[PDB]
Amino acid sequence: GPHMATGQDRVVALVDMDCFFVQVEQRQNPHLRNKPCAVVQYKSWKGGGIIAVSYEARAFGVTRSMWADDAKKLCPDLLLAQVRESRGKANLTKYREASVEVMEIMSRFAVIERASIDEAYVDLTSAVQERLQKLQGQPISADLLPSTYIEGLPQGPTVQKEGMRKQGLFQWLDSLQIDNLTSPDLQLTVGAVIVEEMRAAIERETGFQCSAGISHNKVLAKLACGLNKPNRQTLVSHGSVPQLFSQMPIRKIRSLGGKLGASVIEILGIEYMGELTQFTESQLQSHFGEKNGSWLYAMCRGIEHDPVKPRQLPKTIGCSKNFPGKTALATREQVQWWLLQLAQELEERLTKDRNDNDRVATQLVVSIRVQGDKRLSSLRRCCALTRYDAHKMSHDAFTVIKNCNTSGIQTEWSPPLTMLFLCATKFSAS
DNA sequence: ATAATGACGCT
DNA sequence: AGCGTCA
Numbered sequence: 001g002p003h004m005a006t007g008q009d010r011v012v013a014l015v016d017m018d019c020f021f022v023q024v025e026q027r028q029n030p031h032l033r034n035k036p037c038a039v040v041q042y043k044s045w046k047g048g049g050i051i052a053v054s055y056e057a058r059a060f061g062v063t064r065s066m067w068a069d070d071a072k073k074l075c076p077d078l079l080l081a082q083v084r085e086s087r088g089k090a091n092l093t094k095y096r097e098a099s100v101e102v103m104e105i106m107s108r109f110a111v112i113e114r115a116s117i118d119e120a121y122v123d124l125t126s127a128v129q130e131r132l133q134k135l136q137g138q139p140i141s142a143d144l145l146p147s148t149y150i151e152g153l154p155q156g157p158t159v160q161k162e163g164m165r166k167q168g169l170f171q172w173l174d175s176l177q178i179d180n181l182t183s184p185d186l187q188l189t190v191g192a193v194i195v196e197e198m199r200a201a202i203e204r205e206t207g208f209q210c211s212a213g214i215s216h217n218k219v220l221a222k223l224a225c226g227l228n229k230p231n232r233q234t235l236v237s238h239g240s241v242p243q244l245f246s247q248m249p250i251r252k253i254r255s256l257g258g259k260l261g262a263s264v265i266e267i268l269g270i271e272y273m274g275e276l277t278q279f280t281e282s283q284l285q286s287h288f289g290e291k292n293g294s295w296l297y298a299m300c301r302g303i304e305h306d307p308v309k310p311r312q313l314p315k316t317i318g319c320s321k322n323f324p325g326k327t328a329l330a331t332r333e334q335v336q337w338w339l340l341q342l343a344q345e346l347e348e349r350l351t352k353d354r355n356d357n358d359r360v361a362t363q364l365v366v367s368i369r370v371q372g373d374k375r376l377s378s379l380r381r382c383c384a385l386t387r388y389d390a391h392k393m394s395h396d397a398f399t400v401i402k403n404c405n406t407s408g409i410q411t412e413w414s415p416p417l418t419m420l421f422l423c424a425t426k427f428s429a430s
Numbered sequence: 431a432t433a434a435t436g437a438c439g440c441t
Numbered sequence: 442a443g444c445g446t447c448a
């Protein structure tokens with residue numbers, strides 16, 4: 001009753017760019033706008049691998065990870081933009097720079113946590129408090145929420161989707177108690193007004209469209225964001241959670257899309273997130289451990305405490321290249337040349353980082369994958385990063401891995417290497 | 431033969 | 442430190 005926490009203490013948003021790398025290429029090349037379009041890396045093998053897809057192309061069934069030659073079979077008029085290639089590898093600089101454009105705009109509104117190249121969580125609790133003060137006790141007009149969906153509405157006693165959107169919004173606003181500055185539903189609504197403003201600013205200042213979720217925590221905000229992509233935002237209230245979760249597959253919830261989510265399903269014999277409510281916290285802890293158990297117990301009730309961390313910048317700077325199949329590296333000279341290519345890209349990015357962000361990386365992590373091993377990494381080794389010098393970094397990287405080579409002939413490398421990865425870590429102020 | 435990344439938990 | 446998970 002009066003002591004049961006409801007997880008309604010915060011207003012959190014997740015803003016995610018729509019088909020992000022595609023929009024970056026469409027801004028640059030007007031010929032690609034409003035067309036079925038995809039971004040591809042590496043053209044020679046099967047036309048390249050697709051890493052981003054416009055919504056027009058998605059309607060033909062084009063997806064990420066598809067080969068471009070195959071995507072063209074589904075969508076003969078598909079247009080393609082290629083990722084820049086530098087020093088023999090994909091170079092993602094253009095998309096990193098476009099990411100900064102969007103992150104810097106979001107940071108004007110609130111503390112953000114960069115969660116990927118194209119999304120950030122936003123803690124709007126404070127911003128909402130102040131806007132509520134400015135807004136007297138004035139009603140909130142539907143005109144202030146022109147792209148907002150209220151999940152779960154309309155309900156009760158129109159055949160167009162915009163008609164549906166409005167009806168639900170009307171029911172929501174009609175029910176809202178504006179006199180109470182402490183109403184969680186009110187707080188979420190004001191949060192959504194602010195996110196409309198944020199999303200308009202992003203589009204005005206960059207040309208990029210995005211979607212967003214507004215709820216009381218990160219997991220619900222992220223889930224909400226995806227419910228009405230593209231170019232729309234969704235409010236998921238605490239009250240909407242039982243119905244929303246009642247048919248929500250467990251794998252759709254952030255962090256449950258992998259092996260843990262699968263074991264939840266297998267061990268407990270359930271399918272939907274809401275079904276988790278029937279287990280005691282101790283029961284969930286017994287199956288999945290203390291941390292996962294407690295997290296699941298609260299999360300299936302719509303409650304989560306993970307804070308929006310104040311971090312706009314990546315914690316690591318890395319670059320990697322795979323060498324699949326026949327191309328696996330099999331000579332020492334091959335290994336050294338590619339370590340040099342990676343180290344050169346790293347130096348350039350690190351030097352830029354140091355100038356922009358007043359920090360220096362102090363540790364170098366070297367990772368390789370060996371032929372036959374289907375793990376991401378077969379081996380990780382680290383050394384000190386004391387100089388932003390590509391030749392030193394590549395030399396040092398070789399030094400810490402060179403003993404992996406089981407070959408008798410030292411000019412040869414065995415087993416062949418299917419991946420090289422250099423990562424600069426442990427930043428300190430500079 | 432998707433690739434290229436990036437955060438974080440466990441021991 | 443080095444490995445595993447999730448995205």
Ligand SMILES: Cc1cn([C@H]2C[C@H](O)[C@@H](COP(=O)(O)NP(=O)(O)OP(=O)(O)O)O2)c(=O)[nH]c1=O
Binds near residue numbers: 016118
């Ligand atoms: C998931 C994923 C994304 N990306 C890149 C391309 C995407 O445009 C960008 C953002 O990822 P996303 O938000 O998961 N997908 P999207 O922004 O292209 O499309 P939407 O968010 O579903 O509208 O990151 C990859 O390069 N490999 C990946 O596995």
Ligand SMILES: [Mg+2]
Binds near residue numbers: 017018019020118
């Ligand atoms: Mg996106």
Ligand SMILES: [Mg+2]
Binds near residue numbers: 016017
């Ligand atoms: Mg994203």
